[PDB]
Design a protein around this nucleic acid. Sequence first.
RNA 1: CCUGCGGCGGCCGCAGGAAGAGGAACGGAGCGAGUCCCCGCGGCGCGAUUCCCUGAGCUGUGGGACGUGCACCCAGGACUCGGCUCACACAU
Lengths: 129, 129, 341, 357, 64, 64, 330, 91, 94
Amino acid sequence: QELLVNQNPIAQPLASRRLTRKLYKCIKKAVKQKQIRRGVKEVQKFVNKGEKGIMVLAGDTLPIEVYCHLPVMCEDRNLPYVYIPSKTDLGAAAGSKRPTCVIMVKPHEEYQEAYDECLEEVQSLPLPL
Amino acid sequence: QELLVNQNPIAQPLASRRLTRKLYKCIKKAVKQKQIRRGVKEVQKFVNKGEKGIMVLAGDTLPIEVYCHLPVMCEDRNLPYVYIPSKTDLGAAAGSKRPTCVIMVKPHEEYQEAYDECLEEVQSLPLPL
Amino acid sequence: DTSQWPLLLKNFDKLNVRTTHYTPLACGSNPLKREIGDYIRTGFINLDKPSNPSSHEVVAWIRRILRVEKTGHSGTLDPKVTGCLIVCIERATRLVKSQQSAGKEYVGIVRLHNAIEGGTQLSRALETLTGALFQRPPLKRQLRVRTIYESKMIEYDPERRLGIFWVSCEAGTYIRTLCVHLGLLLGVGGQMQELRRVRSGVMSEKDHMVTMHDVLDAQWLYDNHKDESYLRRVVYPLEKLLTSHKRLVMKDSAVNAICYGAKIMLPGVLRYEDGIEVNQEIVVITTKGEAICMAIALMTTAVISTCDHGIVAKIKRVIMERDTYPRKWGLGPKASQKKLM
Amino acid sequence: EEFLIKPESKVAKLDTSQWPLLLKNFDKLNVRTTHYTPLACGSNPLKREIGDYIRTGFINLDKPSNPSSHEVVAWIRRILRVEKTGHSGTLDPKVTGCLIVCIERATRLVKSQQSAGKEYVGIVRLHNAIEGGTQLSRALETLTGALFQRPPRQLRVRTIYESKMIEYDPERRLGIFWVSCEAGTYIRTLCVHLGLLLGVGGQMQELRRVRSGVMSEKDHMVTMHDVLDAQWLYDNHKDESYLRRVVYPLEKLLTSHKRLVMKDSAVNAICYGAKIMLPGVLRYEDGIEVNQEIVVITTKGEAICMAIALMTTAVISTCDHGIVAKIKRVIMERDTYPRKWGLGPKASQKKLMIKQG
Amino acid sequence: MFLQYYLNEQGDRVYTLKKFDPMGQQTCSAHPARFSPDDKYSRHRITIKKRFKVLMTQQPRPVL
Amino acid sequence: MFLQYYLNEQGDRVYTLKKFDPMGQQTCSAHPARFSPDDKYSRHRITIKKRFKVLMTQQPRPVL
Amino acid sequence: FSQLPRFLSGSWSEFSTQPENFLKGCKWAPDGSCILTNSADNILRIYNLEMVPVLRMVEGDTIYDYCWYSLMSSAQPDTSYVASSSRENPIHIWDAFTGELRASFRAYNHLDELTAAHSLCFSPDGSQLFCGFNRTVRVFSTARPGRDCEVRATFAKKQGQSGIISCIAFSPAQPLYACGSYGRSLGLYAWDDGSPLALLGGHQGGITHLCFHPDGNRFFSGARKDAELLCWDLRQSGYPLWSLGREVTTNQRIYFDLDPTGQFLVSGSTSGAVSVWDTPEPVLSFLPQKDCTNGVSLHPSLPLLATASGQRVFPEPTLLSTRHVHLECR
Amino acid sequence: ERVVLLGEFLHPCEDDIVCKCTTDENKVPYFNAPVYLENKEQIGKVDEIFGQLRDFYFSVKLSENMKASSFKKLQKFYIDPYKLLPLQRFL
Amino acid sequence: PPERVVLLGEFLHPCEDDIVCKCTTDENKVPYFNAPVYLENKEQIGKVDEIFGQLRDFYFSVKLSENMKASSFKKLQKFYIDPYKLLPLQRFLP
RNA sequence: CCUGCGGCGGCCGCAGGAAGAGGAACGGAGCGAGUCCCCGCGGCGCGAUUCCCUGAGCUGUGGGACGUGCACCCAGGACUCGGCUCACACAU
C-alpha cells in the first residue's frame, strides 16, 4: 500500500520506497538493543549533547510546530535526517501501538554494515531548494 | 565537426570549411616569421599607418563593442577581411592557448602562392544581399 | 485601456474622482514628447559602469560629452566594480537623495583561503549573516549597523575555492567587509574577488540599460545628422523613477501657484489616490502628467472626501521651473470677495 | 497621440466600499455639514507606528491546553513588553478555544467583550449505555433556554439559545455537542444535568471554544508560538510584517455598531469628558434609535469613545440644537488631539458677556 | 485528546470523533501544540517556514 | 575576471562560473567593454549596427 | 662524476592521471631525509629516502615558490615545517609529518588588500622569513606569526631596483644578502640596516635563480631566457668574471645549484640535457630523458641527484612526466 | 404539621432518583431540603435543582439505602411550605 | 591591570592565528576597539580587533599577545575585560 | 455635575476637566554662504626599432619601460544667516 496523501508542506526530503524498508529493519535491530531514542523530548535532550547519528521524521504529522526545530538543529550540528510517510507504521516498527513522529538511531556493531549503508544513502538524497 | 552556433550577428561573411583550413595553414606559415599582428591594439595601430594585408576576425567575440569598428575601418582603406568560426583555434594557429579576436597577416615570399590564392578567394566571397 | 496610458498617468481611471470641471490650457507638454532641448535637461541615465574608472569620473565624462551643467549618481561604486548606476542631468539632481538611499543588490565572488567541507557550509554561514549587522569601512574608525535583507548561494567551485553570493542589502553596507567577516566565520579565511551591482533603487538590470558606447553614439548621431531617434532610447524622463509614489492630480490654474510656493489646497485638487496617510510623501502631477513637486501629505485620503477647503499638503521639493504655466491665482468664486473688501 | 484627462460635466460618485475596517462607507452616511478645519494629529488605525499599533491592539489567540487563562495573559504580556493586558473570559486550565487578548490600551472594552454571546463544542462521556443515538439529541433539546445552574455555590440562572449533537459513539459512550450560550454559563454543570436527565450520569471530558463575541475561529487565529516568532523576528530583522498579522487594531471589534463622525475640535473635549452637542456632528448613520449603543469616531476613522444615543436619526436630521449622546466609555488617550473649546462665537460671547457682568 | 476535524470546501472546521475524513484523508487534532514560555527555537521555525514558503507573512493579506 | 552568465527561457541573467551553457553554448562575460572618453569610431560602430539590423533603434519600443 | 651516473629509482605513475601535467622543481631537505616536489596540479609531494608520496598537500591556484626550514632536524617535530606561497592565498606553512596546516603569514597592500609573495626564503638563524614583492621585500619573524612585518623598499622613489623580485639568497661569509628581479637586475643589501651597497646587471632575461659558494666570495645567477650563467665575485667589483652555456627556450625556471663540497656545479636545460662543471671547465653531460629538465638538486650528505621533467604543449587544429633519482660519485 | 406537594417520580439514576417539580406557581425548594411522603417519614434531601425556568427538575438522594424499586412509576412526594422560595426572586 | 573584571565571551575556534570568540556578556554591552582581554587569572592575552554579527548575538575576534598560541585555548573558554571599556548598545539601537 | 484610574452590585480614595466645537493665506519657495553629516605609488590618449611581451606573472577583450600631454578628486542633507531673488497664492 503506497498512498502519498496527507503529507506535511515540509515533507521534503522524503525517503525512497526501499529506503523505508531498510530504515525499518535498521530501527528494529536497534530496538533489539538499547541504542535507540524515542519521543521529541528525549530527542532534544540527547541531540543537544552530541550523540551523532540518524534521525527519522514522520511525514504526516500536524500541527507542524511540535517538532519543526529539529530540521534546523540538525544543520547547526551537521546531522542527517530523512522523512518517512506514516507515523503509525513508524511506531509499530519502534515497538508500540501509540505512534510517534521522531525516531533517532545510534550505531552499533551488530548492524554496522546496514547502518553505514543507510547513512551513506541518506547523505546522497537530493537537496530541495 | 561544424556546428554553427554561438556566433555574433555580424558574423558574415563566413569562411567555408576548406577555406578555414587554408587560412589556418597560411597563418601558421606567416607566424613562422615575424610578419603577423596580434590583438585589437596592434591591428588598429598599424592599420592607420597603411601596411596592406589580410584581416581575419573571430566569429564568436562578445561583446562586439571591443572590435566592431574594424569591418568599416577596413573599408575606409579597401582591405579584405573574413570571419573564422572560433577564437581558440585562431589562438592555437597563432601559437598560443589563450584566444584572440583579430589577426592581421602580412605577405612574404615563403608562402606567397598560398597567400595569393587565399587572397583571391577572399575577394571572391559573396555578400548576404 | 487606461492601463496602456503612460507613466504617472497609467491607471488614473482607478482614482477617487473629486470634480470633473476645469479650464484646459494649451501650455505644457507630455513628458515623453518634450522638446529635445529640455527632454535631456530633465532626465536620468540607467548606466552600466565599466571597471577601470572611478564613480566621480564616469559622470564627469557623461557631463562633458552631453554638454550639460550638473550631474549626480545613485550609488558610489569603487573602481573595478560594474553594474547599475543612475546619473541625473542638472534639473534632475533634485531627486538625487531619494536615489542615494534605496535598496541595492549585488553579485560577487569570495576567495576562500583554505579548503572547507563544501557549499552547504558556506551557505549556512551566509544564512547566519542576515538582518542588522555591524560594519566598518574597508579602508575615521567608527562602528555602525547595516541591514542585509536576503542572501543566497549561486555556485561553488571546490578546486579554485570560489563562491558566488547574491545579496539584497541597504545603502552604505560594505561587501568588502562582509566578505572578511564571512571568512572569519568559516575559520578558513576570505577576500572579495568580484563585485557587481545588479539593482539600484527601482531601476534593475533587466530592462533599460545602456553602455557608454550608446551615449557617445547618440550624441555623435545627433550632432552630425541632426537626428535624435537614438537619444530618445538612451535618456528617460524623471517620471520613470517616481512611478511608485502616491499621485495627486490638479488643475491648470493651480500649477503655477504651487511652482511659486503656495501649499496645495483642496479647491485646486482634481483627483486623489486611494491610500494616502499623514506625513507620507506623495507626487503632485499635472493633467498632462508631469512631476510638479514632491509633497508631504497632510490629509488622509478620507479627510479629503469630507472637507471643502484647507491645506492638503506641503511641498518638500519642487521640480518644474517657475514660469511654465501662466499666473492664474487671485480670481475665483472666493478670494475675490476679500479683494472687494 | 496626445494624453490628457479631458474635462467633463457629469458628476461622479465615490466608491468607499473597499475602504478600511472602520472608514468603510462614508458615502452612505447622511451628511450635515462639510465646513471645518482638520489638524495634523492622529493617524489611520491600520497605519499607526508599530509602537502605538500594538498598544491599542488585540490578539485572537488559540489558548494552549496545559496552562490557565491568567497564565497565558502573563506570558503574552511578558513577550510583548507591554504593561497591562486582559482577556475575553476565563477558561478551564484544560480546555482550548479562542481567547481575545486586549493589549494595554484596548482593555477599556474588556468588560463589553466579556459579556458577549459565546459558543462551545465539547465531548460528554456517559457512565452506562443508552437506548440509542437520538436519545442524546432529544434530551439535549429538552434542556435549553433559560436554565437553572450552579457554580461547580449560590444557584444562578443562565440561558442557552440553541444546541445540537454531531455524532455519538456507542462503544466508548462518547458524544460531541455544539452549544450557544451567554457569558458565564457553565458547561460542566450542563453535562451533569444531561446525565441526570438521561438517568445514567455523565461528565465533561473535552471542551473547545469556537466563537467568542465577534471574533471566531474562521478568522485570523494565532497560536502562542506565533507571538514569540513575531516578536523575535521584529527584534532581529527589524521586519514588522509578521507582527501586523497577529496584532489587529481595536476598531475591528466595533464594526457592527452605528457611527457618528466628529469635528477635530470636538474630539479632545469628549476625551476630557463632555456632552455630545450638535455643532460637532458632521455625519451620522441612518437607523439610530433612542438609548441605543453607538460609537462616535474621528474623520480619520478611529473610534474615540462609546455613546448612548439620545436623539433618533430623524430628529437629528431636523433639529436646531440639543444633546446628541452621553458618554459611556472613553477609549482614546486624552491629549491625542489638542484641546480647543473655549474659542468660538457662542462660547466667546458667553465668556465675554459674563466677564462684563 | 479525542477531538478531530476536517475542512470542507467552504473552508471551516468540521469536528468529528473518528480518525479519517469520509473521503479517505486523516484528520488533524483540533487542539493546538503545547507551548513552553522559555522557548528558544523561533529562528529554527522561521527558517523552515520561509524556506517552504508556508509562513503566515507569505500568505495573502486578510480582507478588511 | 571569473564571473560569467547565460540567459534562460524567460530572458534574465543566470549567473554561472563555468564557461559553457548546460546546453553546450558559450557563456558571455558579465562585464561591459572598456570605454575611452575620446573615442573616434562612433560612425564605424553605427554604420555596421545599422547594416546588420542590431542597432538599438531597430529594436521594438519598450512599454511605459 | 667519473662517467654516466647510475639510475637508482623513480616515480612516474601518479602524474599520468592528468591530461596535461609537469613538474616544477625539486629540493632536498637540509639534512637529507626527504625531497620536495611541485606539480601542475598545485599539489606538493614528499618522498622519503616506484616511489609513492607519503603526503599530498593540496593548494589553491598557482604556487609561486616554496622552501624548507633553515634548520630542519628530523629528530625534533618543531623544526620540520615547509613554507609555501600561492597566487592569491597568504604564505601557508604546513606540518611536514601529518600534512596539515600549521600557521600563516599575511601580506597586506596600502589599500588593505592581500598581495601574494613571489619569492620567499628563510634566514640563516631561522628566526626571520624574507619575501619577494614588486619593488619591495617584506621582512617577517617566525615567532609571532600574523600580518605584522617590516617593509623594505627595494626601489626608492627615484633610483634602485625595479621589477618583481623573484629570488632571494644569503651569503655565509659576511652579513650580506642579495635579491633578483624580473627586471633583469641583481641587488645587494646589508642585513642590519638594509641600505643598498651595490647593484648588478648583465642578463638578457628575468633572473630566476641565485646561489652562493661556501667561501661566500663567489656566487652565481640564472635567467629566464638568457643562455649564460654569470659568475660574479664580491672582492674585485669587476662585475662579470666568467660565463657558461645552456639552452633556455621557454619562460620557466630552470634549477641549478652547487655541491656540498663546493667545487661541482650542476645545471639543467630545456632540451633535457644535464651538464656539470668544476670550480669553469665542463666535466660531464648526460641526458636523463628526452623532455625538458628543469629541477636539479644535490644531496647534502651522500652522493645523490634527482631530476624533474615536463613542459607545456602548444597544439594546433588537425610525452610523459617522470621524477628520477641518480647515484653519483663526488 | 401539614406539608405541600413537591415532586413526582420519573426514573431512578445510578445513585439517586429524578423528580419532576410541580408546585404552587412553580416555587423552588431549598437545597438539601428534607422531603417527606404523606406518612411523614423522610425520604432524603434534594441534591440539586436544574431545568428550565418555567418547568424544571430536581434529584433527591435516597435514605436508609432503600432500593429504587420501592417507588412506583409515578408517586408524589411532599414538602413543608416553610422550606421553599418564590420563583420571582431570581427573575 | 584593573582591580575588577567582567565576563566578556567564550572561545569558539581559531582563524589564521587569531581566536574567534562568541560574545556572552551581561545584557548586550559591546566592547571597545583595542581593549585588552584578560583570562581568569587577570593576565593579558590579546586585544579585541574585529566585531561582527547580528545586533542581538554577535561575535568578535582577538589578536593574540606576544608568545601566545591559538592552540593553547580550549574548545569552550572564558575571557574577562576591564569594565571601564564596554559601552551600551542603546547607541546602536535606532 | 462629567470622565479616567485604584481600592472592598455598591461604596470609598485620588486625578483630570467644567467643555455648546473658531480661523477660504499662515507663514512659504528657488539660490548662496558658514558650521556638521554623508564619502596625489590612481584614470585616458599619443609617440619611438614591428617600442616590448602568449612569462610557469594576471594579460592580447590586454600587461610593462621611456617620453609625453590630458582629464578626475564631487554632487546632495541638516543647523545658523546679524544674506540675494521671486512671491505672499482657497485655483473661476
